[PDB]
Amino acid sequence: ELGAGQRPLPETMIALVRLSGSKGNAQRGLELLAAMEKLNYDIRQAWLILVEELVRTNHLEEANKVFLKGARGGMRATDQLYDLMIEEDCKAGDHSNALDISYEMEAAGRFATTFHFNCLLSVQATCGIP
Amino acid sequence: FPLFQLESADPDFYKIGYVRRVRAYGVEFKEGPDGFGIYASKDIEPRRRARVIMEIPHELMITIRQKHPWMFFPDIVPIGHPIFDIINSTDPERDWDLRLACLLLFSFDREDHFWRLYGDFLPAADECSSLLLATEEDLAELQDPQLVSTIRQQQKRVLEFWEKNWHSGVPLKIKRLAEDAERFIWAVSIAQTRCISMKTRIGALVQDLNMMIPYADMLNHSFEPNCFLHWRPKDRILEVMSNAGQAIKKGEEMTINYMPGQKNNMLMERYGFSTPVNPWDAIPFSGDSRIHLNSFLSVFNIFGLPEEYYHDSELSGDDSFVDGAVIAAARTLPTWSDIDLPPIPSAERKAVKELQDECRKMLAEYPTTSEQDQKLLDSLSEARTTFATAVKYRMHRKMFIGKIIKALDIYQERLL
Amino acid sequence: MIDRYKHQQLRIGLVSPQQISAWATGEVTKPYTFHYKTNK
Ligand SMILES: Nc1ncnc2c1ncn2[C@@H]1O[C@H](CSCC[C@H](N)C(=O)O)[C@@H](O)[C@H]1O
Incomplete structure (x- = not known):
């Protein structure tokens, strides 16, 4: 398509980004997101799709790397994805990532509730330091 | 070489606010056949942050608590005044516009109140576009039975409130507020079309208020506004701020989103x-x-x-x-x-x-x-x-x- | 908001003879301060 001089549709890039996440290819998914920015598209929706695919396909470690890059880059995630990332990290014993995200969630403008605190506490209660 | 090369509002409109610490920056109030508006008097260049367009002191507003109990900020109703009993007899959910209308009519009666002066720039009964003032023939042109029935219920609710509370036995200090039903209907129309509801902090008290804010009720509505309202708690000033990073051209109308x-x-x-x-x-x-x-x-x-x-x-x-x-x-x-x-x-x-x-x-x-x-x-x-x-x-x-x-x-x- | 958590502690305790040795290694065995001739 690029070699033919045609401009890929925003939906076309989203199909490739979602496919990359299903295989756990976070590097390719991030390369395609960079192309969408270069094509002047809106990468917020495609970034959201990439993170949920990695979480769904048990690539939580890769999902955290992609999510934090978008969140630190200024993008604001959806409330459902915020609750997904915090909960999945705390179920896996990853307090460091779950605390990083919840700090970014509040910086965006979404204040943590009892649900998010209960996720962090589930890991803090097992560290041996009350 | 330099040798070889919508009407402005009443000048007193801005001046009465200006002598009471109202500030407008880079905008002018202009009047047309469809009403007042706020327009950029010059090219408002984008900045890293939202620019202050207007500053309105709290003491020039008429505000009432959205939620019971009814407290007024600033408190203008004297203790024991019969107008509070009328305000207190309203439905807490539905009758916010009646409560504001009573405060508005009461404010017009006070010699020192700012809205005695500001009320002269409010649209009159034949100039306000509120459907509370619409006749049955005007409602016939809507071609919307659901909206028509909604307006008729509003007009019935407003009228019955006046008849109940402005009967013959009420004191003169109440009668002189709304001598006729149309005067009270007009006040409710002003309340509905101009009320701005925000969450404010006044001192240490955070609460939701229904506010009548002069010079900010001249901003027209847009679903893609170039301005937004911001309460500044420290000095009790309502700010009209243009969107951060948005360039506004000279003559462009300044708008807010009334109802997202x-x-x-x-x-x-x-x-x-x-x-x-x-x-x-x-x-x-x-x-x-x-x-x-x-x-x-x-x-x-x-x-x-x-x-x-x-x-x-x-x-x-x-x-x-x-x-x-x-x-x-x-x-x-x-x-x-x-x-x-x-x-x-x-x-x-x-x-x-x-x-x-x-x-x-x-x-x-x-x-x-x-x-x-x-x-x-x-x-x-x-x-x-x-x-x-x-x-x-x-x-x-x-x-x-x-x-x-x-x-x-x-x-x-x-x-x- | 979430507090910026900061967990720092200091504790004092009585010290074992083993910890005393681990500090030094280192045994001072002579009551001499400085040589008179060499000033060393
Ligand atoms: N986008 C818009 N289109 C048509 N009328 C508008 C409008 N935004 C605001 N208005 C009018 O302005 C009123 C809100 S008060 C806003 C200023 C008003 N023209 C005045 O003289 O005080 C509404 O009743 C409506 O009739």
């Missing part, structure tokens, strides 16, 4: 106006025929999530077609989506054709068209403000349905 997410029938019930580019307006489709949501959004460069749909105006160049109506079309059209399944063009044409037929069936319900309504407005010479408002409302809905037929035609061809 609200349809034109809600804008008509509250503020007595409607917009043809309302991005939340809906149209009842059968759902038998559906188009591809992803394709429709990408054809018109509508990006974002459904609740934050916006037009990437830099991806169209000069396509003036896409506006709030097409965004409203995306939200109201029957759509299907299957993650990344593409749509068959021949099956989408059948849906587009059937959707266009259903759009024309609804236009045929209206006795006149949107062009015939537009020339009716131009031909008016002795029409009430609400009559023209009622005609603009039905024309806007026709313009919206007509935009959907145009958008579907473009979408069907751009799918090749």
